[PDB]
Amino acid sequence: HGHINDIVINGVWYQAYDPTTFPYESNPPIVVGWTAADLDNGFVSPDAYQNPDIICHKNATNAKGHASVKAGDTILFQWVPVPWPHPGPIVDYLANCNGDCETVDKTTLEFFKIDGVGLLSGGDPGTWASDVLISNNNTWVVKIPDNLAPGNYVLRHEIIALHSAGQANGAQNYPQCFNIAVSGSGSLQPSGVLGTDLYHATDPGVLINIYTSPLNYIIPGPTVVSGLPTSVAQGSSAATATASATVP
Ligand SMILES: *[C@@H]1O[C@H](CO)[C@@H](O)[C@H](O)[C@H]1NC(C)=O
Ligand SMILES: *[C@@H]1O[C@H](CO)[C@@H](O)[C@H](O)[C@H]1NC(C)=O
Ligand SMILES: *[C@H]1O[C@H](CO)[C@@H](O)[C@H](O)[C@@H]1O
Ligand SMILES: *[C@H]1O[C@H](CO)[C@@H](O)[C@H](O)[C@@H]1O
Ligand SMILES: *[C@H]1O[C@H](CO)[C@@H](O)[C@H](O)[C@@H]1O
Ligand SMILES: *[C@H]1O[C@H](CO)[C@@H](O)[C@H](O)[C@@H]1O
Ligand SMILES: *[C@H]1O[C@H](CO)[C@@H](O)[C@H](O)[C@@H]1O
Ligand SMILES: *[C@H]1O[C@H](CO)[C@@H](O)[C@H](O)[C@@H]1O
Ligand SMILES: *[C@H]1O[C@H](CO)[C@@H](O)[C@H](O)[C@@H]1O
Ligand SMILES: *[C@H]1O[C@H](CO)[C@@H](O)[C@H](O)[C@@H]1O
Ligand SMILES: *[C@H]1O[C@H](CO)[C@@H](O)[C@H](O)[C@@H]1O
Ligand SMILES: *[C@H]1O[C@H](CO)[C@@H](O)[C@H](O)[C@@H]1O
Ligand SMILES: *[C@H]1O[C@H](CO)[C@@H](O)[C@H](O)[C@@H]1O
Ligand SMILES: *[C@H]1O[C@H](CO)[C@@H](O)[C@H](O)[C@@H]1O
Ligand SMILES: *[C@H]1O[C@H](CO)[C@@H](O)[C@H](O)[C@@H]1O
Ligand SMILES: *[C@H]1O[C@H](CO)[C@@H](O)[C@H](O)[C@@H]1O
Ligand SMILES: *[C@H]1O[C@H](CO)[C@@H](O)[C@H](O)[C@@H]1O
Ligand SMILES: [Cu+2]
């Protein structure tokens, strides 16, 4: 259980949606993260994998601003509270908004996977991507590909928690969506998958007992785009400056 407090984009700190705070305000601010109803720091379950809640989390509605980024930039996600409590994989996706992300229909988004890290070693439980996040003060770093075509995209970052995933409907997904506007010179526009088609409750990386050894793990969802590393070098770094979500 947790949520993202902020993202840091080449040293530039942006406030994220805070579902434990903003819904208690009369006039919450416009931020880069989607509005969502995880006030309990909770999860989407496999029984909602074919429901809109899996796309950007519970009842999510569009962020009303966006963070402008350069293709090749890295983005750091900051989870709270410290420490993230569960074993599981970590994955990131982009979807072209074919227009402003502030107004895109989330059910139309076609997501392509730009990273994914799963079981790094061992078993029962073994070492996972989430352990790397925990070690890096609850952060994860994703690189925006150098050659991504300029455009507006939703960045969908997600932790999957597998501690209870031996039972049907046991896996816990924690998607968090952000609006970015990408500038660059490249033309890469990869083929994507609808949010409600990414995952199925019987997938071998969703219905799985991690408390066994030896253990192998197939990360759920589509392949990482050819040519991209499945992760860039992880490691936390401080912000040097602060920005606000840019409104259209
Ligand atoms: C999400 O929306 C539905 C429909 O309005 C509502 O009944 C539900 O309580 C909302 N979920 C949360 C956790 O607020
Ligand atoms: C670790 O992350 C939390 C959440 O951003 C923050 O309160 C804390 O100061 C961070 N630790 C350091 C050493 O910055
Ligand atoms: C510190 O370094 C990290 C690692 O790439 C960035 O994501 C962050 O925005 C800051 O530059
Ligand atoms: C491109 O590839 C993806 C699979 O990653 C499909 O979902 C899409 O329809 C197209 O074939
Ligand atoms: C995933 O499921 C949703 C329904 O919630 C559809 O809109 C979508 O096209 C896909 O089948
Ligand atoms: C797990 O297996 C079921 C078959 O009963 C599939 O429908 C699902 O897509 C997943 O592969
Ligand atoms: C639990 O399951 C793993 C496979 O997931 C086996 O390799 C192990 O021997 C144990 O039966
Ligand atoms: C889990 O435990 C088994 C026990 O044989 C190991 O072989 C495996 O490599 C993992 O550590
Ligand atoms: C992941 O990679 C495979 C093979 O390169 C593609 O078929 C898929 O669409 C995705 O880009
Ligand atoms: C996947 O596809 C891209 C383009 O062909 C290659 O760059 C990569 O090495 C892998 O074949
Ligand atoms: C992403 O996944 C690839 C292939 O599974 C690993 O080789 C890489 O180190 C990273 O974990
Ligand atoms: C991306 O990050 C993972 C997790 O640290 C590494 O295992 C991988 O080699 C790459 O650095
Ligand atoms: C990752 O951790 C470092 C401390 O190692 C912080 O400076 C950074 O803000 C992030 O929390
Ligand atoms: C904080 O400060 C550093 C150095 O001036 C920048 O690289 C970063 O983008 C932010 O302005
Ligand atoms: C701009 O301001 C934010 C919060 O006001 C800090 O988190 C950041 O380090 C930067 O100084
Ligand atoms: C940019 O605008 C945002 C949204 O009002 C503020 O929260 C931020 O401090 C800066 O004024
Ligand atoms: C939104 O985008 C504007 C540029 O259009 C930036 O100046 C701002 O910092 C935020 O990324
Ligand atoms: Cu939890």
Side-chain angles (χ1 to χ4, degrees):
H1 285 55
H3 64 272
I4 302 186
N5 183 69
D6 61 85
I7 68 179
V8 186
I9 302 182
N10 276 11
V12 178
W13 189 98
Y14 294 83
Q15 187 183 22
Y17 181 79
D18 189 355
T20 64
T21 300
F22 290 17
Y24 305 103
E25 298 171 33
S26 299
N27 196 24
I30 303 183
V31 297
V32 300
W34 281 55
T35 294
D38 48 328
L39 279 65
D40 65 353
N41 279 339
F43 52 75
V44 183
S45 290
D47 70 4
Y49 279 177
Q50 274 60 71
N51 180 273
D53 284 350
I54 189 72
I55 300 157
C56 291
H57 218 307
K58 285 194 209 212
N59 299 351
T61 54
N62 303 57
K64 297 189 185 207
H66 62 253
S68 292
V69 320
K70 277 169 161 198
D73 279 345
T74 57
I75 303 187
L76 177 150
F77 305 95
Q78 173 78 67
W79 289 85
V80 301
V82 174
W84 176 261
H86 309 304
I90 293 168
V91 293
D92 295 273
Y93 301 82
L94 299 171
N96 196 320
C97 293
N98 304 291
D100 288 350
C101 297
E102 285 79 358
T103 59
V104 75
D105 187 341
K106 66 183 179 176
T107 63
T108 70
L109 298 171
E110 299 267 15
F111 291 101
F112 51 97
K113 188 184 284 180
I114 62 160
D115 83 351
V117 182
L119 173 63
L120 296 171
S121 70
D124 191 34
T127 306
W128 295 81
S130 58
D131 291 307
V132 178
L133 178 142
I134 287 154
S135 169
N136 291 139
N137 195 45
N138 256 35
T139 63
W140 188 263
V141 175
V142 70
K143 179 176 162 168
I144 302 298
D146 292 338
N147 292 342
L148 188 73
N152 303 318
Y153 302 85
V154 175
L155 173 52
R156 188 194 176 262
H157 173 75
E158 187 189 31
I159 301 172
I160 302 195
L162 302 183
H163 63 292
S164 291
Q167 187 56 276
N169 205 41
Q172 306 172 353
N173 297 48
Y174 300 83
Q176 297 278 267
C177 292
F178 303 89
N179 292 347
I180 67 179
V182 176
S183 277
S185 86
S187 67
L188 186 72
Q189 201 52 245
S191 175
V193 173
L194 292 166
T196 54
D197 293 332
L198 292 159
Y199 309 132
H200 286 89
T202 50
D203 287 354
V206 165
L207 183 57
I208 181 176
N209 181 19
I210 69 183
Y211 302 106
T212 178
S213 190
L215 180 66
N216 294 146
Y217 184 71
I218 303 177
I219 299 180
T223 42
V224 172
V225 177
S226 180
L228 308 186
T230 61
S231 56
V232 298
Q234 289 304 300
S236 180
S237 80
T240 55
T242 292
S244 295
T246 304
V247 302

